[PDB]
């Protein structure tokens, strides 16, 4: 399935906390999408962010994979919102998520495609 | 009367202050709300500082990823004009060094506050 | 008129100069493999904190987007970027994911307008 999470968040957090978020994100991907964690990936990007016209700690989480998302979107949102709430104090009302299934031909990994 | 949930992820490579980045995020959300037509409480924006190039040269540039649950069809031109005027005014980025993408998402692929749509 | 773009999110500890070199080479790769002139090839290099397989390690995610012109070139594109990131940033091929997306022109904005 090759799940990936690009997490763009604007909290003032330590680098350690960013690493813990990346770690928990890969665990979340494996547990909810159901694949072995060795193929789960995550990048955490620090941003300057706003929600509803206000500058507030917030996030956008871009989930992409070679299928495996259909029906699992709700569970992933609840896990990620609890995580960013727990590690960065970001409110659920200030987090957007996106889920996108990609065909193998448009998925690159280790010099090749699927 | 119809909920659209617009988002703009702005990746730009200008040398600008954090305050100017906040102003960009703020104006971006106003632009989204005014042009896509939704209440601004549902418009969101993240500004990401990058190292960037255009046309083989290293130059002030940006990539603006606009996403929503519909509401984009026909509004892309107006959005391109307002964002290019914004990044030019605040960061000095030329219109010829900004790319934008527009993507309409189905509700089931949109997460918010522990649930989906 | 393909307008290729590469958004490179990588978590290596590299200099700003090296990041410019990656962006510079990225546009050349776009121009050479998609077959277009480089004047419309564009790239952003974004520094992240990243992991692969539950561990924190240098890794990358590469978002390749254009108005078509990708169909069939993805294999070649993955090979060049994986070699580029290995050579300039020491990132292993097994810690790089890539995505390819063809956009219709009406959903492609540039210089105050669309296509």
UniProtKB/TrEMBL annotation, chain A:
<dbReference type="GO" id="GO:0005615">
    <property type="term" value="C:extracellular space"/>
</dbReference>
<protein>
    <submittedName>
        <fullName>Macrophage migration inhibitory factor-like protein</fullName>
    </submittedName>
</protein>
<dbReference type="GO" id="GO:0050178">
    <property type="term" value="F:phenylpyruvate tautomerase activity"/>
</dbReference>
<dbReference type="Pfam" id="PF01187">
    <property type="entry name" value="MIF"/>
</dbReference>
<dbReference type="InterPro" id="IPR001398">
    <property type="entry name" value="Macrophage_inhib_fac"/>
</dbReference>
<comment type="similarity">
    <text>Belongs to the MIF family.</text>
</comment>
<dbReference type="InterPro" id="IPR014347">
    <property type="entry name" value="Tautomerase/MIF_sf"/>
</dbReference>
């Amino acid at each position: 399935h090759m799940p990936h999470a690009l997490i763009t968040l604007s909290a003032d957090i330590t680098e350690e906390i960013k690493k813990e978020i990346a770690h928990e994100s890969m665990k979340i991907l494996s547990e909810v999408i159901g694949k072995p964690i060795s193929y789960c990936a995550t990048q955490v990007v620090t941003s300057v962010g706003g929600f509803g016209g206000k500058i507030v700690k917030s996030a956008f989480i871009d989930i992409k994979s070679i299928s495996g998302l259909k029906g699992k979107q709700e569970g992933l949102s609840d896990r990620y919102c609890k995580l960013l709430e727990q590690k960065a104090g970001i409110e659920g009302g200030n987090i957007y998520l996106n889920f996108t299934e990609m065909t193998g031909n448009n998925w690159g990994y280790d010099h090749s495609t699927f």
